[PDB]
């Protein structure tokens, strides 16, 4: 597997959705801080949505780690994949979205031969 | 509070060069603890003599226990208290087995019948009545008759359970 | 402010609602008190 690590605690799995993005179509879900003078969200009235705070920060030991325990590194070619040769216990390769299928076959073959875990090996597989 | 103790508190003015060995004034104070006893002592010395806690001293505080706690006595109690529109002196009689218990009953009774708090009451004097025919209140005299005996009609028994299967009775 | 001239109400509040009757035959809602000493008899009749 990956390097041993403590249990990963998230401290907030629920997405921080913008106030009234469920009310109006024009208000997107991307988080925005309410700045109104009277806003109940800004004033933190009970029963309202929670706002992002630095106290929600992830434990630095487990930060950026996937559930499998690897940090994700985006690769576009074999040479990009080769940089993880000595870091197979801490990093897993992820193949970029715009890599062609025939180049993905080569990347996957090299990754299997070197022992790098690929996050998305089923992308663009012919069958 | 109502778990009253009786303390003797003896104090004096702070000794000076002109008058060493002051006169050692003493009171009997009904209070829940010694801190309150000492405070009540200074309050009363404050009111009677030209002395205060700063210019004075507490030489002794001692709890006074009942001589015969298991001997039913009759107590005459003289109190002075403040009503909503004046100050009044009262005399009351308590049948009880100790002075602290009698004072407890007195405070409960003053609170109940005259809405007088502990704040408003001065205990002037508590004295055992040495013999009958000196008891002046009928609510105490009625318990001094020979071979006194009374029933307790309509006994209500406390249930440990929500439901009962038997339609309880009040015989006793 | 008050009505400024008193007048009795228009119509009777006890004949409400002023809706169509449920049936063309109005129903008898009370019959005469029974008296067991008299012979058996009908309390009402139907006609047109």
């Amino acid at each position: 597997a990956s390097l041993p690590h403590p249990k990963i605690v998230k401290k907030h799995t629920k997405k921080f959705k913008r106030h009234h993005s469920d009310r109006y179509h024009r208000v997107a879900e991307n988080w925005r801080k309410q700045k109104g003078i009277d806003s109940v969200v800004r004033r933190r009235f009970r029963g309202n949505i929670s706002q992002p705070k630095i106290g929600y920060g992830s434990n630095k030991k487990t930060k950026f780690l996937s559930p499998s325990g690897h940090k994700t590194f985006l690769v576009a070619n074999v040479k990009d994949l080769e940089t993880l040769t000595m870091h197979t216990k801490t990093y897993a390769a992820e193949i970029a979205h715009n890599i062609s299928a025939k180049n993905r076959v080569v990347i996957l073959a090299r990754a299997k031969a070197l022992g790098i875990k690929v996050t998305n090996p089923k992308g663009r597989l012919a069958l | 509070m109502a778990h009253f103790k009786e303390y003797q508190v003896i104090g004096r003015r702070l000794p000076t060069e002109s008058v060493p060995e002051p006169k050692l004034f003493r009171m009997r104070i009904f209070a829940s603890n010694e801190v309150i006893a000492k405070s009540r002592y200074w309050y009363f010395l404050q009111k009677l003599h030209k002395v205060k806690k700063a210019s004075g001293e507490i030489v002794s505080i001692n709890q006074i226990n009942e001589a015969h706690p298991t001997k039913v006595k009759n107590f005459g109690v003289w109190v002075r208290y403040d009503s909503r529109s004046g100050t009044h002196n009262m005399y009351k009689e308590i049948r009880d087995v100790s002075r602290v218990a009698a004072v407890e009953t007195l405070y409960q009774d003053m609170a109940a019948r005259h809405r007088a708090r502990f704040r408003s009451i001065h205990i002037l004097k508590v004295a055992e009545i040495e013999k009958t025919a000196d008891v002046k209140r009928q609510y105490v005299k009625q318990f001094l008759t020979k071979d006194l005996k009374f029933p307790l009609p309509h006994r209500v028994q406390k249930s440990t359970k929500t439901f009962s299967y038997k339609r309880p009775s009040t015989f006793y | 402010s008050h009505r400024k001239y008193e007048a009795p109400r228009h119509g009777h509040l006890g004949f409400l609602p002023r809706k169509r009757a449920a049936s063309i035959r109005a129903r008898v809602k009370a019959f005469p008190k029974d008296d067991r000493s008299k012979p058996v008899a009908l309390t009402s009749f139907l006609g047109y």
């Binding site: - | 209500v156 028994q157 249930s159 929500t162 439901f163 009962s164 299967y165 339609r167 309880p168 009040t170 | -």
Partner: protein, 197 residues
């Protein structure tokens, strides 16, 4: 303990019984209340009739059929007291309310079931002797309940049938106790007495 609890409402105080029953239903106990017409309210009859007339005069001004409803039957006066003691506008409170049945008299099948009392709501245990009290069937009749007499007739004939049942049961109980008397001073009886039975 038992799946259904049948409370004889005779001689109970309405509010204290309603509080007990509300807690039972919310805790998940099925309750049937019988003889609601024999429930008691503290205070004199005139005073409680005045209170009910104050309740009667509260109605929605622009439409009386959507206003507060004034149910006259004793079982409904008790039910109304238990509401307001239950959060009836929620699903949990509604679920508690389907756990309750209230009747005047003792209709079947409860007329042959065991009835219980709630001692903490019993008038004879709660009220001070000499305090005046009201009877629910009499208050309901003065308010407009129509069925006091038919309930009384049905209660009288139920009491007759129950009396013959009790006479049969008392005779059988006497002979069972007689047989248990003959079982004494035997070795099995002596051992059971030693063990506590």
């Amino acid at each position: 303990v038992e799946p259904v609890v049948v409370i004889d409402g005779k001689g109970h105080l309405v509010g204290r019984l309603a509080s007990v029953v509300a807690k039972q239903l919310l805790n998940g106990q099925k309750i049937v209340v019988v003889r609601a017409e024999e429930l008691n309210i503290s205070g004199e009859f005139f005073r409680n009739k005045l209170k009910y007339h104050d309740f009667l005069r509260k109605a929605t001004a622009f439409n009386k059929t959507r206003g507060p409803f004034h149910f006259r039957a004793p079982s409904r006066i008790f039910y109304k007291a238990l509401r307001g003691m239950v959060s009836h506008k929620t699903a949990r409170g509604k679920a508690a309310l389907e756990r309750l049945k209230v009747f005047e008299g003792i209709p079947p099948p409860y007329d042959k079931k065991k009835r219980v009392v709630v001692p903490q709501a019993l008038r004879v245990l709660r009220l001070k002797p000499g305090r005046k009290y009201t009877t629910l069937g009499k208050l309901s009749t003065s308010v407009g309940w129509k069925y006091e007499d038919v309930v009384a007739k049905l209660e009288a004939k139920r009491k007759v049938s129950s009396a013959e049942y009790y006479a049969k049961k008392r005779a059988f109980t006497k002979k069972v106790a007689s047989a248990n008397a003959t079982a004494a001073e035997s070795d099995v009886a002596k051992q059971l007495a030693a063990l506590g039975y």
